[PDB]
């Protein structure tokens, strides 16, 4: 339920899966930023930074 551009992707499973931050830092920070008020934000922060 997190809104990036028009993705409307589910907050569990990132559109950039895996290693979102490693691909494009700026874009990831934007993606997180856009969904600050969404009640599900912390599924996006739980998905976005951490990766193997």
């Amino acid at each position: 339920m997190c809104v990036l551009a028009n993705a409307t992707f589910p907050c569990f499973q990132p559109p950039c899966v895996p290693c979102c931050y490693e691909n494009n830092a700026e874009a990831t920070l934007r993606m997180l930023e856009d969904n600050v008020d969404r009640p599900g934000y912390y599924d996006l922060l739980q998905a976005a930074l951490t990766c193997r």
Binding site: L29, Y41, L45
Partner: protein, 261 residues
């Protein structure tokens, strides 16, 4: 789960950095939180603990920012003192837990990579009255248990959070040099923006070294625009973009109930 990758230490105005001279410090104290009835104080200082410059989570290193690069120092150089040498329990991120003797000011300091001390002092009353009906200094071998509220070590668990945002800019004169009537802007692998009012010079952003011909250093301007990392919302580093684009990060050490002798 290193949420600290995004984060970066910041250079924060510090009115009293020792000797009474105001200076721009790596360790500027930005909040003291004293809701713990035990006595522990949560200190908000500008430079994360235990997340090295390479973003590994090792604990012996305290990460801080100088210039624009991120350097690290030894953990064991951390010293907090209100009137006497305080005692630290908790360290993660920007938060340090300290138990301190009563005083009137509050100092935090760490040693630079060049083995020079850098500190910040703030005006904080800190006259802890321990719970109960007797102002005792240390706990006895015999007594009652009353509920005190204090900060634990459990690094995560919701509710309590801070606002991060994009580092605004970082004006520097190091990147500008004068090459025989031209202005040479080095980059050093970081995106750099310039506004030269030398006519043709024009404004713009680059990722690689260049220069502007027939211009003076005293007439141009330059600032490095990082966007990869993230910073604290701190009142002493300006904003970067209208109506605020504010991200969020969980903060360590929530408070909970403990038995207080």
């Amino acid at each position: 789960f290193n949420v600290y990758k995004a984060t970066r230490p910041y250079i924060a105005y510090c009115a009293d950095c020792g000797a009474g001279h105001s200076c721009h410090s790596p360790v500027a104290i930005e909040a003291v939180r004293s809701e713990a009835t035990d006595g522990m104080l949560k200190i908000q200082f500008s430079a994360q603990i235990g997340i090295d410059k390479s973003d590994n989570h090792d604990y012996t290193k305290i990460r801080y920012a100088d210039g624009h690069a991120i350097e690290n120092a030894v953990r064991s150089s951390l010293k907090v003192a209100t009137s006497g040498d305080c005692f630290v329990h908790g360290t993660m991120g920007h938060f340090i837990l300290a138990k301190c003797p009563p005083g009137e000011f509050l100092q935090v300091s760490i040693q630079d990579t060049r083995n020079a001390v850098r500190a910040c002092r703030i005006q904080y009353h800190h006259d802890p009255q321990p719970v109960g009906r007797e102002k005792f200094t240390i706990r006895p071998h015999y007594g009652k248990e009353i509920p005190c509220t204090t900060y634990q070590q459990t690094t995560a668990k919701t509710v309590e959070e801070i606002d991060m945002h994009m580092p605004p800019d970082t004006p520097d004169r190091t990147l500008l040099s004068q090459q025989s009537g031209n202005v040479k802007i080095t980059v050093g692998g970081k995106k750099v923006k310039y506004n030269c009012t030398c006519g043709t010079g024009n404004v713009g952003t680059t990722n690689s070294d260049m220069t502007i011909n027939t211009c003076l250093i005293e007439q141009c301007h330059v600032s490095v625009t990082d966007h990869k990392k993230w910073q604290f919302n701190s009142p002493f580093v300006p904003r970067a973009d209208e109506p605020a684009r504010k991200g969020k990060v969980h903060i360590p050490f929530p408070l909970d109930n403990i038995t207080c002798r």
